[PDB]
Amino acid sequence: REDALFDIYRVMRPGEPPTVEAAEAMFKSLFFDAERYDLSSVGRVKMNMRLE
Amino acid sequence: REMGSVELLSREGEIAIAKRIEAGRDTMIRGLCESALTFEAIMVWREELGTGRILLREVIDLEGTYAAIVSAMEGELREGVMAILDAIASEFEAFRKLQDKLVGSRLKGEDLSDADRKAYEGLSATIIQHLKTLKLNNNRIEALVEQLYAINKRLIGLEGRLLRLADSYGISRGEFLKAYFGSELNPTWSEQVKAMGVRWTKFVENDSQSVTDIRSEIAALATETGVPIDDYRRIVQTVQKGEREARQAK
Amino acid sequence: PGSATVLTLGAHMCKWPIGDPSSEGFTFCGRRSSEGPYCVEHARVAYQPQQTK
Numbered sequence: 018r019e020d021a022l023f024d025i026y027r028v029m030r031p032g033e034p035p036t037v038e039a040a041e042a043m044f045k046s047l048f049f050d051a052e053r054y055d056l057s058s059v060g061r062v063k064m065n066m067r068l069e
Numbered sequence: 070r071e072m073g074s075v076e077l078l079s080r081e082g083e084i085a086i087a088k089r090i091e092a093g094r095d096t097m098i099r100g101l102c103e104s105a106l107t108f109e110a111i112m113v114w115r116e117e118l119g120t121g122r123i124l125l126r127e128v129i130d131l132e133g134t135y136a137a138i139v140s141a142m143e144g145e146l147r148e149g150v151m152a153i154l155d156a157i158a159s160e161f162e163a164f165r166k167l168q169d170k171l172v173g174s175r176l177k178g179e180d181l182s183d184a185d186r187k188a189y190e191g192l193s194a195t196i197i198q199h200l201k202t203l204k205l206n207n208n209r210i211e212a213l214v215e216q217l218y219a220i221n222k223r224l225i226g227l228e229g230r231l232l233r234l235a236d237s238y239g240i241s242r243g244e245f246l247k248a249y250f251g252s253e254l255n256p257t258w259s260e261q262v263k264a265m266g267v268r269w270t271k272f273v274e275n276d277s278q279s280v281t282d283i284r285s286e287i288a289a290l291a292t293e294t295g296v297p298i299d300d301y302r303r304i305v306q307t308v309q310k311g312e313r314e315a316r317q318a319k
Numbered sequence: 320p321g322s323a324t325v326l327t328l329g330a331h332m333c334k335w336p337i338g339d340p341s342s343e344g345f346t347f348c349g350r351r352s353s354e355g356p357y358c359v360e361h362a363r364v365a366y367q368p369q370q371t372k
């Protein structure tokens with residue numbers, strides 16, 4: 018999982034040097050964080066309808 | 070990336086870096102206050118100051134004076150600086166006379182050993198102790214460091230030219246300094262240094278016989294213009310080392 | 320106290336200051352500390368140990 022986090026950090030921010038906790042925090046803030054990945058309720062309902 | 074992957078956050082090392090900068094400044098001041106043109110220029114410039122020239126805020130920092138002890142502090146430090154200059158004028162004159170005698174002995178060949186070096190050291194130590202305890206400012210220190218750096222660059226260029234002219238067949242560049250440190254008094258340095266090695270004779274005859282003479286003439290002309298030879302070299306070297314250490318700490 | 324003054328400081332040596340620069344005795348460690356300004360322990364304590372960020 019550390020290698021996957023490093024790869025994700027390099028893909029998103031190639032210039033910045035990926036770190037163990039920095040890469041894990043980047044993915045969380047990108048997708049696991051509701052502050053940035055603010056998917057509306059219409060998106061969630063559309064996902065629930067498309068894939069049950 | 071350079072800041073992060075390379076540089077590390079100095080935690081609790083700020084005070085250490087400040088102490089290192091202070092040590093570098095101390096080294097630069099110690100190298101400055103020595104037997105050379107810096108001590109003569111700082112003493113001659115301070116002779117006109119105090120009465121008709123800038124006595125404070127341009128030679129010695131007012132805060133540094135009373136730091137270890139505005140109108141009262143200004144007049145108090147001014148009288149002290151004037152008394153120090155009046156007491157060290159004779160020492161500076163004796164040091165200048167000793168430096169001139171040493172330069173003459175080095176340009177003629179005779180070694181001044183009949184207490185001449187002792188008198189020169191005694192006259193230089195008094196001036197050094199007076200300048201160190203005076204707590205001068207950095208205004209004139211900047212000009213002194215600039216002049217020392219210019220003289221050092223000129224000397225390094227001359228040494229590099231001499232090394233390039235003498236290292237044609239089998240000579241090197243690092244031996245030129247070792248040869249000129251112990252074979253600078255005699256004018257025929259390139260002729261009296263042909264002890265061993267066949268390449269040295271070929272480099273001295275028709276290879277660098279004129280280059281060495283031109284370098285010696287340039288050194289003799291630069292000695293009178295500023296500080297003499299054999300004494301200002303180590304001074305500028307140590308002051309440059311101190312400045313480099315301070316810049317590295319910064 | 321160390322074993323190297325502020326003048327005889329060569330390359331690949333420790334540079335951590337000890338004491339007061341405006342004092343009488345002020346020297347550095349001056350040991351085998353290549354690839355680093357300070358020695359091992361002093362660089363570790365000064366480089367923000369437990370770097371997690």
Ligand SMILES: [Zn+2]
Nearest residue numbers: 335348358361
């Ligand atoms: Zn150390």
